[PDB]
Paper text:
Furthermore, [name] has been shown to play a key role in forming the characteristic terminal hexarabinofuranosyl motif of AG, which is the template for mycolylation. The [name] protomers in the two states share common structural features which include two periplasmic domains (PDs) and 15 transmembrane helices (TMH) arranged into an approximately crescent-shaped bundle.
In this study, we have determined the structures of a substrate unbound [name]-[name] complex in a presumed resting state and a donor DPA-bound pre-catalytic conformation which we define as the “active” state. The [name]-[name] complex is captured in two states, one with C2-symmetry and the other that is asymmetric. Another structural rearrangement upon DPA binding, by comparing the structures of the two states, involves α6 in PL5, a short α helix that interacts with DPA, whereas in the resting state, this region is disordered. Considering that the bound DPA is the major composition difference between the two states, it is reasonable to speculate that the dramatic structural rearrangement of the enzyme complex in the active state occurs upon DPA binding, and is mediated by the induced disorder-to-helix transition of α6 at the dimer interface.
Author numbering:
A (entry chain A): 838 to 886
B (entry chain C): 3 to 80
C (entry chain A): 23 to 50
D (entry chain A): 936 to 1082
E (entry chain A): 149 to 502, 521 to 738
F (entry chain B): 542 to 591
G (entry chain B): 641 to 689
Write the structure that this text describes.
């Protein structure tokens, strides 16, 4: 279990917020996630704190 | 056949085309005021009457004479 | 009639012969 | 990784704020795409890899349905063993699927979008054509099919 | 020099002798006589660069079988066959008018009497045309229609080796001509709206009055025909898969063979021949139109024997077989019989050689309406209000299409599109049959209401899942529909078992007169069809308003007027 | 045939209709509702013989 | 006899033989539907049980 270092998020602007809706991580493996094909299944717990 | 056999036979053909049993079928009651026929459906009974009786009914005389006394009073006009 | 029957039969069999021959015709 | 099983694990890559653009913005109506059989009506604007007299245009992208329908139904319908467009593009091009996100519906597998890339210079051919042949019912031989 | 012909692959080295082996004349003729082992040319690639050495020349002949256009002879033959058959048809129309009966009062009196069912099955059909689901093979038809104009031979784009499914595809040429204008989903599916409107307008105004005075008199009968039409139309043929057009054409050839019987003419039958040929021409599952022509063949042959006495037998049969064969003029427009048999033998060589809340509807809207209507038509030999002739031809269409389309033809099972038209009128036949005025025994009516609720329980068992993108925001796309904890399938099975025991108690006690049954079973077919129509239109209305700022089927079709793409505009 | 002909000559209408009702009624709560693999013919070996 | 393949007596499968004789009987029935015979003995001798 690792807690990562803090990342500098972009500037406080709504015109920036518009066209940047997602913060994304290119994860892999079995992970707990809220799909719509099936319910909130349980792989491993990786999440953005 | 004057007004009995012909009426019953023509009601058997009405039964063949409009699907109403030959009991209700009488001369006092008619096509659009009592029973339910239409402008297009009446050609089926017309051509069948042309069939068992050699009576070439004009398309206009068919619609002109309105009740089912039409068919009797006309098949007896040979 | 006797003026519509003959055209009805010649055009009937003409359309038949022509339509059945349409798959076996030349193509570029 | 709270799992003693050997079939459980995770991998992580640092977060990003991607420079997203719509499909119509990025993929216009100029680059031909290999729209799969399940998704043509949903994408009406991009012209497909239209073919002319037996040769096709080299496809640039492969817009495709959701993963399960892509694997079980679509790819079986389009492979080289029974005709198919993936007979010619998988033999020539290299598909590399990108990331795509359905806007304001995150967690929905809309489909996929795979960028093709060529393996050589790959100039388009000249294709010298001659058109005088007038057969009656002369089909010269059977096409190549599976054995 | 290397070769690879039909009987080639003998990559020989001219003038060279082998060092090990036999000499065989010392010519190095080596290969395998086989067309099976040919290359798949994607191009030609090398690594050497710069001017060609004299002798280097790869000059391959590509496959160009189907990309053809007809010569002047074949075009003149097509134009002459078309003008000759229209000449023959109008000559038949001239010869046939010997009984008089001129076409007076156009648009018959039973038309223009619009009622609430017409406004419902027009407005709800338009609302389904906008927001409703597409078919499964909508993109399959659209993509090949788009490429077919530039390619010029209607290629079955994806599966087979660019082979034209030109054995039977002319309707795709109609879509290909349509695609000259913008190909938005709101607009290219316009035949699925137009054939729905003329399907309804034929069904309510020309099929059902022909079916009898009873079906026309009863409002419930026309209401059931409308709701079963709309309920059978909306899942399957509101895409581009051409089963609304086959349904419409089978309805046209049925109502034309009806016109031919009721009027005593032969030109509506002669039009029904070529209409059945065109609807056979749309798809190989367009055999329902041939089935309608066969099961209305006996009165036509009676009309032939009827006009045989006056005119010659030959000038009547001749325009019939003319209109039967003019399908070949349109189908073989740019395809020679050689190339269609080649496409056929590829399609049989590698093709297929012989489950949702509202896709298993086919069991609801023929399989429990046509069977009770059949049993009623059999048990009662002469009913009062049902014309026995066209009702039996209406049965024969639905039955006869099954025995050489459902089991013998290879087209995935689970079809309801085709019976959207004629199986709509079958429901109108069924509802007056199971009405309380015809069925006297309350036991049979209560057992039929139990059958209604059992079939609705069978229909709701599966998940409310639409084919691909319609499935965007649906009530129960992932799970079984459960309203109030327990599934609604259990609610229909409980009410079906209640109606079953209520019927069995009337079987034992032998009542047949309790009013409660009369008030309960008064027209259960349009109530069931109204429930299916409402649950489907609610499913897709919740789908569009749930996923509003993103891509729904409805918001895509509405935004298509604004010049926007359907799904591309909101896939980041 | 039992429906179309209301009274046939030689067939007892009562037990013939009960013989039909056995085969029909078993389908509506055995074939579709009960979970036993489809494709059964054993059971109707006796009564579906008659 | 045919545990692995479809039963084929004499080259073509016997299913085709039954489908050909079924289509023959179907057209023989439809011709009696059109002509309205109902009395040809050949049918009596054929369909006896």
């Amino acid at each position: 279990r690792l807690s990562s270092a803090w990342y500098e998020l972009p500037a406080r602007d709504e015109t920036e917020r518009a066209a940047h809706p997602l913060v994304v991580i290119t994860a892999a493996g079995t992970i707990t996630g809220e799909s719509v094909a099936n319910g909130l299944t349980t792989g491993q717990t990786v999440d953005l704190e | 056949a004057t007004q009995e056999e012909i009426i019953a036979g023509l009601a058997e053909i009405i039964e063949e085309v409009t699907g109403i049993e030959p009991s209700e079928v009488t001369p006092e009651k008619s096509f659009v005021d009592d029973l339910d026929i239409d402008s297009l459906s009446m050609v089926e009974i017309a051509v069948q009457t042309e069939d068992k009786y050699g009576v070439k009914i004009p398309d206009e005389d068919l619609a002109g004479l309105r009740t089912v006394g039409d068919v009797v009073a006309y098949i007896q006009k040979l | 009639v006797r003026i519509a029957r003959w055209v009805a039969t010649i055009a009937g069999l003409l359309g038949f012969v022509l339509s059945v021959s349409i798959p076996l015709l030349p193509v570029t | 990784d709270l799992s003693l099983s050997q079939g459980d694990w995770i991998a992580v890559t640092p977060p990003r704020v991607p420079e997203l653009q719509s499909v119509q913005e990025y993929v216009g109506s100029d680059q031909p795409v290999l729209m799969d059989w399940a998704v043509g009506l949903a994408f009406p604007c991009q012209q497909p890899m239209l073919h002319a007299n037996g040769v096709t245009e080299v496809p640039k992208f492969r817009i495709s349905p959701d993963y399960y329908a892509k694997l079980q139904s679509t790819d079986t319908w389009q492979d080289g063993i029974n005709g198919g467009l993936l007979g010619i593009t998988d033999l020539l091009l290299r598909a590399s699927v990108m990331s795509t996100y359905l806007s304001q519906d995150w967690g929905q597998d809309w489909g996929s979008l795979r960028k093709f890339d060529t393996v050589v210079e790959a100039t388009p051919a000249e294709l010298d054509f001659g058109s005088q042949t007038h057969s009656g019912l002369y089909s010269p031989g059977p096409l190549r099919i599976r054995p | 020099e290397i070769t690879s012909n039909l009987d080639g692959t003998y990559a020989d080295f001219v003038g060279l002798t082998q060092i090990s082996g036999e000499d065989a004349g010392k010519l190095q003729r080596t290969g395998y006589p086989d067309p099976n082992l040919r290359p798949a040319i994607v191009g030609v690639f090398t690594d050497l660069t710069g001017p060609a050495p004299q002798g280097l020349s790869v000059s391959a002949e590509i496959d160009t079988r189907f990309t053809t256009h007809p010569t002047a002879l074949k075009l003149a033959a097509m134009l002459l066959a078309i003008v000759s058959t229209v000449i023959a048809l109008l000559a038949l129309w001239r010869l046939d008018r010997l009984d008089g009966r001129r076409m007076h009062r156009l648009i018959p009196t039973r038309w223009r009497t619009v009622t609430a069912v017409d406004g419902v099955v027009v407005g709800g059909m338009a609302i389904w045309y906008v927001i409703g689901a597409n078919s499964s093979d909508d993109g399959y038809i659209l993509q090949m229609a788009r490429t077919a104009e530039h390619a010029g031979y209607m290629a079955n784009y994806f599966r087979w080796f660019g082979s034209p499914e030109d054995p039977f595809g002319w309707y795709y040429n109609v879509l290909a001509l349509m695609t000259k204008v913008s190909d938005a989903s709101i607009w290219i599916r316009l035949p699925d709206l137009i054939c729905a409107l003329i399907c309804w307008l034929l069904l309510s105004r020309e099929v059902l009055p022909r079916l009898g005075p009873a079906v026309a008199g009863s409002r419930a009968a026309m209401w059931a025909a409308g709701l079963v039409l709309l309920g059978a139309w909306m899942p399957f043929n509101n895409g581009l898969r051409p089963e609304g057009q086959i349904a419409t054409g089978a309805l046209i050839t049925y109502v034309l063979i009806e016109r031919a019987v009721t009027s005593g003419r032969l030109t509506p039958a002669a039009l029904a021949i070529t209409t059945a040929a065109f609807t056979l021409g749309i798809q190989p599952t367009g055999l329902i139109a041939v089935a309608a022509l066969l099961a209305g063949g006996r009165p036509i042959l009676r009309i032939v024997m009827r006009r045989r006495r006056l005119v010659g037998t030959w000038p009547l049969i001749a325009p019939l077989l003319a209109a039967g064969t003019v399908i070949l003029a349109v189908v073989f427009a740019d395809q020679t019989i050689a190339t269609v048999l080649e496409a056929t033998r590829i399609r049989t060589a590698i093709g297929p050689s012989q489950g949702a809340i509202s896709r298993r509807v086919a069991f609801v809207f023929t399989a429990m309406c046509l069977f009770p209507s059949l049993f009623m038509m059999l048990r009662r030999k002469h009913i009062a209000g049902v014309a026995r002739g066209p009702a039996w031809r209406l049965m024969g269409i639905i039955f006869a299409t099954m025995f050489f389309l459902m089991f013998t033809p290879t087209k995935w099972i689970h079809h309801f599109g085709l019976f959207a038209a004629v199986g709509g009128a079958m429901a109108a036949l069924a509802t007056v049959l199971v009405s309380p005025t015809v069925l006297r025994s309350a036991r049979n009516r209560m057992a039929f209401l139990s059958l209604v609720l059992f079939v609705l329980a069978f229909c709701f068992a599966s998940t409310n899942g639409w084919w691909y993108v319609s499935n965007f925001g649906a009530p129960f796309n992932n799970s079984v529909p459960k309203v109030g904890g327990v599934q609604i399938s259990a609610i229909f099975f409980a009410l079906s078992a209640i109606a079953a025991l209520w019927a069995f108690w009337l079987h034992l006690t032998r009542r047949t007169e309790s009013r409660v049954v009369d008030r309960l079973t008064a027209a259960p077919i349009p109530v069931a069809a109204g429930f299916m129509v409402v649950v489907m239109m609610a499913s897709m209305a919740i789908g569009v308003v749930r996923q509003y700022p993103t891509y729904s089927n409805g918001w895509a079709n509405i935004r298509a007027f604004a010049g926007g793409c359907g799904l591309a505009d909101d896939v980041l």
